[PDB]
Amino acid sequence: SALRVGTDGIYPPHSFHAQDGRGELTGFDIDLIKEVAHRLNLKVEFFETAVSGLITGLDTNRYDVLVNVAITPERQKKYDFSIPYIAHRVLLVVRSDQQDIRSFKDLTDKTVAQILGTDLSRFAKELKSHLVFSHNFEQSLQLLLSKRTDATMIPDIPFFNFLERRPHDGNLFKIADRMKDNSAVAFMMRKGNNKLTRSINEILCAIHLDGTYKKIFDRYFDKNIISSVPGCSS
Amino acid sequence: SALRVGTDGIYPPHSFHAQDGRGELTGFDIDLIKEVAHRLNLKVEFFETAVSGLITGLDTNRYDVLVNVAITPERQKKYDFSIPYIAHRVLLVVRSDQQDIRSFKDLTDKTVAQILGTDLSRFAKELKSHLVFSHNFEQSLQLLLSKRTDATMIPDIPFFNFLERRPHDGNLFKIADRMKDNSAVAFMMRKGNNKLTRSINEILCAIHLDGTYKKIFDRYFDKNIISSVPGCSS
Fold it and tell me: Which domain of life is it from (chains A, B) (predicted)?
C-alpha cells in the first residue's frame, strides 16, 4: 500500500526542500507523483539519494519509481517508463562574455561542468571536453561563474528557474547554443509491473483532463518558455 | 514474420490509397508503422477496417496494432499504448455564415456530422445533438458544406489537410471553438502485449533521434499548424 519514490532533493524546481533547503520536500515532479499516488489510494514514501546512486536503488528494490528521467533507447530496453509528463531542452550555457563557444562541437578541449552519472556527462566526455563534476545544477552554474569551467550543458527547466530565483545573476550567463529537439521526461520503474505502469498512465490522463496538470505546471513553470506534453482525450 | 495492422484507408493524410483510391496505402501513420516494422525486421500486413469496427477488430484479434488512436483513460484501462507519436487538437468547425454556434455547449439541439464509434460521436450524443453519421472526415465536411448538418467536431490534422487540397475554400468554414488541450495519439494494442509495446517504443525513440521522424512528419504536415511530440535523448 505504499508507492516508494527515489529522488535527490537539491534540484529546484523538480525536487527541493522548502525554506531555502531547510523544510519539506516539494517541486513539480514531487507534487505530481504525490497526486498520482493519492489517486491510486497509495501513500507515497520518498527516499533521497545522490544522483549517481539513483538508478542502483531502483535496481535493488529500495524504491519503485524514479522521477524526472529522460527517455532514451538504452533505458527503454532495461526499464519501464510512464507516458511522458514534461519535456526539456538541453542548453549550452557559458559566461556572458565568452566568445570561443558557439556550438556543442566547440566543447572539444574546453572545460565543462557536468553531473556525475548523467548522460550529458558522458556526452561531454565523448566530445573530449575536460570535465569537472558537480553535485547539481546550482553547482554547475557556480563552477562556470568562478571560472573553474567554461561551459555547462543544462536543461532549460532548471536554468530558467535559476533565472527566476536569481534575476540579477542572469547577466553573467548566456545561452550559446541549444539542441534542435527537445526530450521527453517520464517516471521510470523496474521492468515487469505492467499493472502499475498502466495505472500511473491512466491517472496522468485524468490529471491532464481535470485541470490538475495545469495547476501543478503553473505552480512551477512559465508556459511561455517551458514545453508541456500534449493532454489526453475523453 | 508479420506485424498485423488495422487501419481505415479513407482517412488522408493518416491512411489513404494513392492514385485516387486505386494504389497502395500511404499516409503519415502508415509510413511510420511500416518504418517501425522494418526496424523490427517484420513484414507489415494491413487489415482495412471501418472506424466503427477498429477497436472491436482489435478485441477480436484480427490484427495486433491500431494506428492513430487518441489516448483516453478508458482506453488505457483496457488496452496497451505506445508512447505518443503525434498530437491533434479537436476543433468545432461550422460554415463561415453560421450565426448561433460559438461553443461546444451550443451544439445541443443542432445537427452535427460525426463518425460512428468515435469519442466525438459519443460527446455529440451527450450534448444532445442530432447526429448524422459520417463514414469519414471528407464526408463530415461535405455534409457541412451541403448544409445537411450545421457543425462537425473534427481534429485539426484532417481539417487542415482538407483546406490544403482546396486552397480557395478556407473562407467557407470557421473554427467556432476548440478544446483547451491538444490530445496525445499513439499506437494501440491488446493488453498484455508488453514486449511488442517496448519494442515499438525503443524504435520510435530511434526514429526521433536519427531524423526519420522529422522526415515523415514534414512529408505530410505543416509544423506551424500541427503539433509534434517531444524527441528522445541518448
Answer: Bacteria
